[PDB]
């Protein structure tokens, strides 16, 4: 290490630090993912008040 | 329709196949914990069997 | 990496147990599983002559 | 009375059917509750990292840029640290013992603004004081208002006059540092972040413009509510110019087969946006009824329009048609002729009235009633909503701008903001002097970046 | 340290089905790498995997393996202009 | 009194009153919830009482 | 922390002589189960198991904070200080709530 | 819920069991009736005390 | 030799284990009988009780 | 009392306590004995109680 | 109180009690008949209370 500023090494760690509960609760071919979010596309709409 | 049973146990189950729930009730004694209930006692030798 | 939590004897090594999974790490010296350059060629040797 | 005797009246109402309880009920692929499924989410970690200085120095009354360091997959969150300096008014104040000196309301949202996010060298987002107090106002989550007044000030004891030291109140104005989450679109939601990974040729870099410490605080008149400004001889210890700062930043990592699996491709991304129309000064005086152009682009979902008491530039973030002024006790008092300047608004398409005069108390409650995470408690802060729901970061009704000729919209002033607009207060009562009002007008819209050859673009333009 | 192919064939199979480009992944050299850490998997119990067994944790490894070198070597192909330049990101 | 005024709306609501009185018992899950969930029909059911 | 448990009560000859009132509380257990309504216990499917629950209360010396008017000291409760004597035993009941599923 | 061992009292443990016969159970709740407190004016405070 | 041929195999041990019973509470001045109720799950093999 | 503080430890026991108390009664034969001796279990045992 | 005082001794006894207290509740139609008649065994019933 090199100290004064580990943060990377620190998540480095933490993602090395993998057991057979971390891979039962994530991982797979199929595991989702975060940051990444699917779009669908709604209806063409508007609004407004009425008397 | 007619009026719904009357009571009496004829009316805590539905005669419709989705929805029956047999209105028997399981018991709170577990399996592990077995009461003895019941026992068995045998005859018991007469005092006096010695004449 | 290691199902075995603690390090054991470093010059004696653990004996292989094979795991369960139903239910109901160094280079230690090799010591034992009849070691024949040596250790146990002296017993050998010694009945010999 | 501890009679409680029921275990079989449940069989009584699952026996209980008929035609209704089995079209909702029922049914061999009816999903059923008590029983959840589980799914695998990718593996991932996630920290704080400081964010590395570039350029600049934090000082008050200046500019200063920070980039956004190379080092994980993701940037998801960004928050400013600041280190408010020491506060202590002299006895030789210009103003003498009728003189007491207080922090701004809203500490925060003050002393930043044109607040920027650009990419490489061509400007992405920037947000500022109306905006911040619009949405924070607005779409507010409660629980976190506690919370939220702890981080940014107004925390009873900055806003809170001092007296002099010679008078009874010779409290100092405590320096804690405050913190200001800053909102982008990738903070916006977790699904939306910047990939630092993918994008190597991108250089990314915040930008914030500190406001001058002179107008700041606030140096008011205990009994004629007069406010004049300050100066470095008015408190002890000076002026500090320069001030200590710091920007901090989130940044996850993620498995290296994601990462591996996820490089080289093109990804669209939908973000939002603001646009600030230009103030307009309004005067009650001459006239009542007051059209303002509105000059946008893109999807635009929300319009927030406020009316800004202007009288000094000490005070800030005020809507009403009275400035706050000292009461007992040491607090700021609220005058009671003190109303929302606005009656009625209405928007006109080209000769085509959209929305009629509608009343003020419509965009005051109705509307964020219907399509808003929470009602504002401060007299302002009206809008309207093209969309279902504001916050949602997925798209909702919303009509662009750039094929629609340009729209304007009117509004009315109001009997107290046209009596206020003239003198002749008493003492204390906010209106003795003349005031002034100005009128701002935030719109928020939608935008899509995408993602080509490791460098983030708008195909739009 | 015979030579297994068919792992190092089913690592393939498992990369491809997600993606997977993996450059300088010949089954030379490797299968007999394979096979002798299979081995020492072999005759050593006490860190195989939960639930799997000595050749899946193999194949397991190198999947791991194979990720992290394909994950390592990814490279940007630099354009004749600028990527970033607003001349790209527009109609043309 | 205290169990209908405060756990039912505790549990099976999105609320709890801050008036004395309001008294609610919910046989769904969600009161507020626009699909349906558990309950009975009093169609089919005779005279019920609250006492 | 109703605003009148917490109120200090002075002795019967100062001004504030009220008595504290007695009213039933409730507490939710934080449990697996309880935490999401799809986890629930399937106690159908456990018979063998036998699900049991502790819980282990406080004396009354520590409930009860005897306070200095003046200089503020706290000293331990006694039993000759509050008229009646501390009652060891309590009126504490747990409550649950099951649901039944079709055949 | 079925008491099976002690009795609810201050500074001691009390032991229950989760009632059987249902299919499943989701919620659990403890209620307690507090005593009186009623201070004395022989305490050993005087009258500059509290409780 | 002798840790070689004893690895590997199941190994079947008898131990003693404790189960302590909730304190109670004795007032004599009220009565001088109390009834206290056990509740313990293994083989007994001895009881202590003291005041 | 002077049942289990002598007779109990004078003939299922090692030793006999030399302080005030210390009441003790063995199902089995020897309590030290780590080989097992007579003894019941009373998880099939329904509830028992001392007095 | 006065349901077992009077009512039960009225119905199902031969006799109605001439002094103040001694209540009562049978399970049977007649108490004294030595013949059987309806009761219930509380062997296999678990623990009831009264109060």
Request: hydrophobic share 40%.
């Amino acid at each position: 290490t090199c100290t004064t500023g580990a943060g990377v090494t620190s998540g480095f760690i933490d993602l090395a630090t993998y057991d057979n509960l971390d891979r039962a609760l994530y991982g797979g071919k199929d595991a989702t993912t975060y940051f990444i979010k699917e779009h669908y596309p709604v209806g063409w709409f508007t609004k407004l008040p009425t008397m | 329709p007619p009026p719904p049973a009357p009571s009496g146990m004829q009316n805590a189950y539905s005669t419709h196949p989705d929805a029956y729930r047999t209105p028997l009730l399981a018991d709170s004694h577990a399996l592990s914990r077995m009461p003895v209930v019941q026992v068995h006692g045998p005859q018991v030798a007469p005092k006096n069997s010695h004449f | 990496y290691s199902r075995n939590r603690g390090y054991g004897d470093p010059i004696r090594g653990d004996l292989p147990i094979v795991p369960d999974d139903g239910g109901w790490g160094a280079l230690s010296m090799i010591g034992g599983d009849a070691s024949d350059c040596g250790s146990t060629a002296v017993q050998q040797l010694i009945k010999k002559y | 009375c501890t009679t409680g005797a029921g275990v079989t009246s449940g069989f009584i109402d699952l026996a209980t059917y008929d035609n209704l309880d089995r079209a909702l009920y029922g049914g061999k692929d009816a999903t059923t509750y008590f029983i959840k499924e589980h799914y695998p989410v990718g593996w991932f970690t996630k920290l704080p990292t400081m964010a590395t200085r570039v350029s600049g120095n934090p000082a008050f009354g200046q500019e200063f840029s920070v980039g956004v360091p190379r080092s994980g997959d993701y940037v998801l969150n960004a928050w400013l640290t600041l280190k408010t300096p020491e506060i202590k008014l002299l006895e030789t104040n210009r103003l003498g013992a009728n003189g007491t000196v207080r922090w701004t309301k809203n500490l925060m949202h003050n002393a930043v603004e044109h607040a920027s996010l650009t990419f490489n060298d061509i400007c992405a987002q920037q947000f500022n004081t109306a905006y911040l107090d619009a949405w924070t106002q607005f779409n507010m989550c409660e629980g976190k208002r506690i919370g939220y007044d702890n981080m940014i000030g107004n925390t009873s004891d900055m806003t809170n006059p001092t007296p002099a030291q010679g008078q009874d109140g010779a409290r100092t104005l405590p320096s804690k540092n405050l913190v200001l989450p800053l909102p982008f679109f990738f903070s916006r939601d977790c699904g939306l972040a910047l990939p630092t990974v993918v994008l190597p040729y991108n250089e990314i870099r915040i930008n914030i413009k500190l406001r001058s410490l002179q107008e700041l605080l606030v140096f008011q008149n205990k009994d004629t509510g007069n406010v004049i400004p300050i100066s470095a001889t008015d408190i002890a210890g000076g002026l500090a110019d320069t001030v200590e700062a710091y920007v901090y930043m989130t940044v996850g990592l993620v498995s290296n087969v994601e990462r591996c699996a996820m490089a080289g491709t093109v990804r669209d991304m939908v973000v939002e946006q603001m646009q600030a129309a230009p103030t307009h000064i309004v005067n009650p005086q001459n006239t009542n009824n007051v059209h303002v152009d509105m000059r946008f682009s893109h999807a635009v979902k929300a319009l927030f329009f406020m009316v800004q008491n202007v009288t000094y530039k000490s005070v800030g973030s005020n809507y009403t048609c009275v400035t706050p002024v000292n009461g007992p006790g040491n607090t700021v008092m609220e005058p009671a002729m003190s109303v929302d300047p606005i009656k009625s608004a209405s928007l006109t398409y080209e000769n085509t009235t959209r929305l009629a005069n509608m009343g003020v108390e419509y965009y005051s409650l109705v509307q964020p009633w219907y399509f808003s995470a929470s009602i504002p408690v401060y007299t302002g802060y009206h809008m309207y909503s093209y969309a279902l729901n504001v916050g949602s970061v997925h798209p909702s009704g919303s009509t662009n701008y750039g094929r629609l000729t340009n729209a304007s919209i009117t509004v009315t002033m109001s009997p107290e903001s046209v009596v206020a607009a003239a003198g002749g207060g008493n003492n204390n009562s906010g209106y003795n002097e003349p005031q002034r009002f100005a009128l701002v007008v935030i719109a928020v819209n939608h935008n899509v970046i995408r993602i080509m050859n490791g460098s983030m673009g708008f195909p739009i333009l | 340290c015979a030579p297994r192919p068919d792992l190092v064939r089913a690592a393939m199979s498992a990369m491809v089905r997600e993606t997977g480009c993996t450059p300088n992944v010949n089954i030379r050299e490797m299968a007999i790498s394979a096979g002798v850490m299979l081995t020492k998997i072999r005759a050593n119990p006490g860190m195989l995997r939960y639930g799997m067994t000595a050749t899946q944790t193999v194949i397991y490894n190198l999947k791991e393996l194979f990720a992290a070198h394909a994950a390592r070597g990814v490279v940007f192909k630099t354009p004749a202009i600028h990527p970033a330049h607003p001349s790209q990101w527009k109609g043309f």
